[PDB]
Amino acid sequence: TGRPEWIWLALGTALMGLGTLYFLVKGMGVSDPDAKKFYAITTLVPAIAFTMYLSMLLGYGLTMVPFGGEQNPIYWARYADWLFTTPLLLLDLALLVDADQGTILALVGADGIMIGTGLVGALTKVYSYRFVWWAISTAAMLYILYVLFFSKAESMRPEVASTFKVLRNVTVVLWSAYPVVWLIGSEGAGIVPLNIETLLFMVLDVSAKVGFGLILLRSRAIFG
Amino acid sequence: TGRPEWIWLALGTALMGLGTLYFLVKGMGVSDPDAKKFYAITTLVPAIAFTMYLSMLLGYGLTMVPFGGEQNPIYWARYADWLFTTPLLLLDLALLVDADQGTILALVGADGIMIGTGLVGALTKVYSYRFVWWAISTAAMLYILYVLFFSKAESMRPEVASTFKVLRNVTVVLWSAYPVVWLIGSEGAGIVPLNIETLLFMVLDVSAKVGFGLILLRSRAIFG
Amino acid sequence: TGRPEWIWLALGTALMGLGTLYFLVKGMGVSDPDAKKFYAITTLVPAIAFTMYLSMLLGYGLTMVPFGGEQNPIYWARYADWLFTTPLLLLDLALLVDADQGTILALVGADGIMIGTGLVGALTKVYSYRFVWWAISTAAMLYILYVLFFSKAESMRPEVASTFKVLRNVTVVLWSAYPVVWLIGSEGAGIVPLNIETLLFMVLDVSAKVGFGLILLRSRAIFG
Ligand SMILES: *C/C=C(C)/C=C/C=C(C)/C=C/C1=C(C)CCCC1(C)C
Ligand SMILES: *C/C=C(C)/C=C/C=C(C)/C=C/C1=C(C)CCCC1(C)C
Ligand SMILES: *C/C=C(C)/C=C/C=C(C)/C=C/C1=C(C)CCCC1(C)C
Numbered sequence: 136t137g138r139p140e141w142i143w144l145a146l147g148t149a150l151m152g153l154g155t156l157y158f159l160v161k162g163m164g165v166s167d168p169d170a171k172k173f174y175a176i177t178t179l180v181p182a183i184a185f186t187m188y189l190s191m192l193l194g195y196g197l198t199m200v201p202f203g204g205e206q207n208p209i210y211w212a213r214y215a216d217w218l219f220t221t222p223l224l225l226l227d228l229a230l231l232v233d234a235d236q237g238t239i240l241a242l243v244g245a246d247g248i249m250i251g252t253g254l255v256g257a258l259t260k261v262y263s264y265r266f267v268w269w270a271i272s273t274a275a276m277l278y279i280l281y282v283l284f285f286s287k288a289e290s291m292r293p294e295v296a297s298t299f300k301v302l303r304n305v306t307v308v309l310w311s312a313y314p315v316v317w318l319i320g321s322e323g324a325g326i327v328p329l330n331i332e333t334l335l336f337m338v339l340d341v342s343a344k345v346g347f348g349l350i351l352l353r354s355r356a357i358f359g
Numbered sequence: 360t361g362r363p364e365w366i367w368l369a370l371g372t373a374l375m376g377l378g379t380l381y382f383l384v385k386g387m388g389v390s391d392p393d394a395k396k397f398y399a400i401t402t403l404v405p406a407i408a409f410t411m412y413l414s415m416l417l418g419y420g421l422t423m424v425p426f427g428g429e430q431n432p433i434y435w436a437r438y439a440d441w442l443f444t445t446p447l448l449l450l451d452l453a454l455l456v457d458a459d460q461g462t463i464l465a466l467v468g469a470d471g472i473m474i475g476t477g478l479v480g481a482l483t484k485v486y487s488y489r490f491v492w493w494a495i496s497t498a499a500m501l502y503i504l505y506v507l508f509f510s511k512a513e514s515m516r517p518e519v520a521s522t523f524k525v526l527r528n529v530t531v532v533l534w535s536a537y538p539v540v541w542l543i544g545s546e547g548a549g550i551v552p553l554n555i556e557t558l559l560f561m562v563l564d565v566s567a568k569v570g571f572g573l574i575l576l577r578s579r580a581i582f583g
Numbered sequence: 584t585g586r587p588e589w590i591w592l593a594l595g596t597a598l599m600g601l602g603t604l605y606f607l608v609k610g611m612g613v614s615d616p617d618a619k620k621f622y623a624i625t626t627l628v629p630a631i632a633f634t635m636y637l638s639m640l641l642g643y644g645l646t647m648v649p650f651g652g653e654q655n656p657i658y659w660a661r662y663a664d665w666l667f668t669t670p671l672l673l674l675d676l677a678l679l680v681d682a683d684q685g686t687i688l689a690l691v692g693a694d695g696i697m698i699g700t701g702l703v704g705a706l707t708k709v710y711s712y713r714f715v716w717w718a719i720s721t722a723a724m725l726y727i728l729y730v731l732f733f734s735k736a737e738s739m740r741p742e743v744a745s746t747f748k749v750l751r752n753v754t755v756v757l758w759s760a761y762p763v764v765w766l767i768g769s770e771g772a773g774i775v776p777l778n779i780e781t782l783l784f785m786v787l788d789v790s791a792k793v794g795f796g797l798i799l800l801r802s803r804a805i806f807g
Contacts, residue, residue: 171461179468186476186495193488195479219471237619244627247667252634255643264641271634395685403692410700410719417712419703443695 136194138208140333144192147337151185154345161352173357176227177348180220184344187216202262207321208329213336214254220344222246225279227347228306231299231356232288242282249275257322269323273314280307298356302347309343360418362432364557368416371561375409378569385576397581400451401572404444408568411440426486431545432553437560438478444568446470449503451571452530455523455580456512466506473499481546493547497538504531522580526571533567584642586656588781592640595785599633602793609800621805624675625796628668632792635664650710655769656777661784662702668792670694673727675795676754679747679804680736690730697723705770717771721762728755746804750795757791 155178162174190196196212222243229239249272256268283306288299316339317323320332327335351357379402386398414420420436446467453463473496480492507530512523540563541547544556551559575581603626610622638644644660670691677687697720704716731754736747764787765771768780775783799805 168459168461171459172464173461175461175464175468179464182468182472186472186479189491189495190479193483193485193491195483195488235616235619237616237621237623240620240623240627244623244630248630248634255634255638259641259643261641264643267637267641271637392683392685395683396688397685399685399688399692403688406692406696410696410703413715413719414703417707417709417715419707419712 139330141192143330143333143337144188147340148185148188148192150337150341150345151181151188154181154341154348155185158348158352167358169359170357172230173227173351176223176230177351180223180344180348183219184216184340187212200258200260202260202265203325207325209257209322210333211254211257214250214257216340217253218247218250221250224306224343224347227351228283228299228302231295231302231351232286233291238282242279245275245278245282248272249279253317256317265323269314269318276310276314280310283307292356294354294356298351298354302350305347305350306343309339309347312339363554365416367554367557367561368412371564372409372412372416374561374565374569375405375412378405378565378572379409382572382576391582393583394581396454397451397575400447400454401575404447404568404572407443408440408564411436424482424484426484426489427549431549433481433546434557435478435481438474438481440564441477442471442474445474448530448567448571451575452507452523452526455519455526455575456510457515462506466503469499469502469506472496473503477541480541489547493538493542500534500538504534507531516580518578518580522575522578526574529571529574530567533563533571536563587778589640591778591781591785592636595788596633596636596640598785598789598793599629599636602629602789602796603633606796606800615806617807618805620678621675621799624671624678625799628671628792628796631667632664632788635660648706648708650708650713651773655773657705657770658781659702659705662698662705664788665701666695666698669698672754672791672795675799676731676747676750679743679750679799680734681739686730690727693723693726693730696720697727701765704765713771717762717766724758724762728758731755740804742802742804746799746802750798753795753798754791757787757795760787 158174158178158181162171162178165171165174187196190212191210196215197208197210199206200209201207225242225246226239228234229242234242252268252272252275256265256272259265259268283303288296313336316327316332316335319326320335321329382398382402382405386395386402389395389398411420414436415434420439421432421434423430424433425431449466449470450463452458453466458466476492476496476499480489480496483489483492507527512520537560540551540556540559543550544559545553606622606626606629610619610626613619613622635644638660639658644663645656645658647654648657649655673690673694674687676682677690682690700716700720700723704713704720707713707716731751736744761784764775764780764783767774768783769777
């Protein structure tokens with residue numbers, strides 16, 4: 136296809152596909168109720184990402200948004216991906232630390248706003264307003280990062296506290312990159328071109344989903 | 360109206376309407392917490408289907424998708440219907456057998472993918488790619504059917520095991536037809552015309568919702 | 584901006600923003616699991632409304648629908664707001680009275696239909712059909728009001744029964760106004776112009792979210 140970024144969409148599609156299949160097969164025969172939850176949640180993440188990457192590869196998950204006197208290619212399918220995958224990833228962390236339901240509802244709500252405002256930002260036709268929505272989404276992200284950092288995992292089992300610590304550190308570092316990439320890429324300032332932006336989001340997505348999942352499902356904390 | 364398929368949309372609308380009202384009235388005065396859940400879930404299904412059928416009848420739930428050198432009438436409102444009604448139907452089955460939450464999340468996730476990929480298939484403008492999404496959706500269906508077949512209902516009460524068995528058999532046979540109808544109808548190969556396709560989906564929908572519901576709500580398994 | 588209704592969108596945006604911030608700060612340091620739920624739910628409501636009001640102010644949450652030989656400005660962003668905020672408000676009430684899950688699923692389902700059918704009504708191009716969807720949505724509202732009125736709060740604590748009583752009375756009176764405003768405004772009969780309609784919805788929204796929240800979070804019923 137004539138779009139330069141197809142290769143990274145293709146690699147993205149393939150790597151999410153492989154990860155889905157790996158987690159499916161790994162979770163076969165697992166009978167422990169708690170372990171089953173973590174496998175269900177963690178396998179769905181790349182499964183969803185696979186379908187959205189495929190949509191981008193085939194050209195369905197793309198549209199043109201006019202701003203700055205140009206038709207700009209915007210991959211809306213990312214936000215459809217992230218709307219479902221990011222709360223599931225937060226839920227993996229929340230179930231691990233046995234978080235109360237009020238805290239879970241706060242994280243998921245804020246995540247919905249973060250993703251929702253991002254999408255509005257992506258599709259906004261007035262250039263200046265795009266950054267207002269970015270700012271609001273980033274504020275929502277910071278709230279999530281604050282809750283993850285400031286907790287009671289050290290009060291319970293060592294395997295749980297240890298695995299939470301690493302997945303928290305991975306999450307905070309990888310998630311924080313997303314707003315930076317948006318800002319400097321096609322959606323924001325347009326400093327880095329769409330092909331490099333697509334490469335960047337692919338490394339981040341695969342790392343935040345497949346990499347994250349491998350760390351979690353190899354841990355002993357997912358069992359009671 | 361000039362569309363030949365209106366009569367089946369009208370019949371569909373009427374039969375979902377009657378079924379909603381029947382289940383509403385039947386569930387009046389029911390105070391048992393478990394029974395109330397099943398009535399809530401089972402009454403919502405035709406209520407949702409009623410609204411979407413009405414949308415199709417009035418022409419709101421229809422759009423034209425260009426493929427194969429023709430503007431093809433696509434009823435998108437079906438997928439809006441099914442996105443909500445199919446997980447509720449799976450939940451009726453899951454609550455009946457007291458399925459663990461990991462298994463419930465797996466079924467609902469896979470169902471979301473099945474319906475989501477179906478819709479993308481429905482709206483895709485490149486003919487060949489429509490069948491790629493059909494295949495992925497069908498793969499998601501098979502996963503759901505595998506989980507329903509391979510379970511622990513025989514470990515618990517006889518009324519529960521008996522009612523699960525029949526509703527499982529109805530579900531598997533009726534659900535399996537949907538991908539066949541899509542494939543041979545307007546959305547796929549275009550072998551059967553839209554009016555017959557609409558008739559076929561109406562028989563299936565009414566049977567999988569109203570018929571299914573009658574079997575469930577007349578059973579003694581819904582009570583503790 | 585050239586739209587007369589901007590001032591009420593601006594005031595709406597500001598008042599939801601202030602309310603979000605007030606509830607955020609008030610809920611800091613609250614460690615009681617039950618209280619945390621109510622703060623999570625109640626803070627998300629204006630947070631969501633803030634983002635949608637902002638969308639309307641900036642012009643994103645608006646589209647033109649042709650009916651009656653005129654392009655009519657329709658703020659679709661309201662329905663996006665209400666789809667999420669109204670079930671959360673019902674959940675505040677349901678958790679307060681310790682409602683069973685069947686009843687919670689009934690309320691939330693009916694609320695989804697109410698909002699969903701409202702949106703279809705809003706975007707329908709055949710004038711007469713707009714009122715059919717209004718009628719169906721209003722029927723769904725009446726069901727919700729019936730469940731709220733006809734319950735067991737008097738069986739449990741006095742602070743809970745007392746706070747439920749006032750929030751029920753506020754809810755029923757404020758919610759009942761919404762269908763009246765739609766009917767007489769731009770979406771329906773077009774008797775009151777869009778600027779007054781926008782003023783009316785803003786008073787209602789702020790009262791049903793911020794006012795409602797203040798009453799709830801100052802009560803002692805949110806604690807165990
Ligand atoms: C599986 C993929 C993951 C974990 C994606 C995470 C994405 C974010 C944390 C995106 C954040 C954004 C902002 C906070 C600023 C606005 C632009 C977004 C949506 C990229
Ligand atoms: C109440 C209606 C029900 C139970 C509908 C069920 C629909 C399906 C199981 C549809 C399945 C499809 C595929 C697996 C292939 C792609 C086309 C679909 C979405 C019709
Ligand atoms: C936070 C805002 C609230 C509580 C909004 C409530 C809105 C309604 C109860 C709207 C009801 C409607 C009908 C029942 C008739 C159709 C038009 C609607 C959607 C305005």
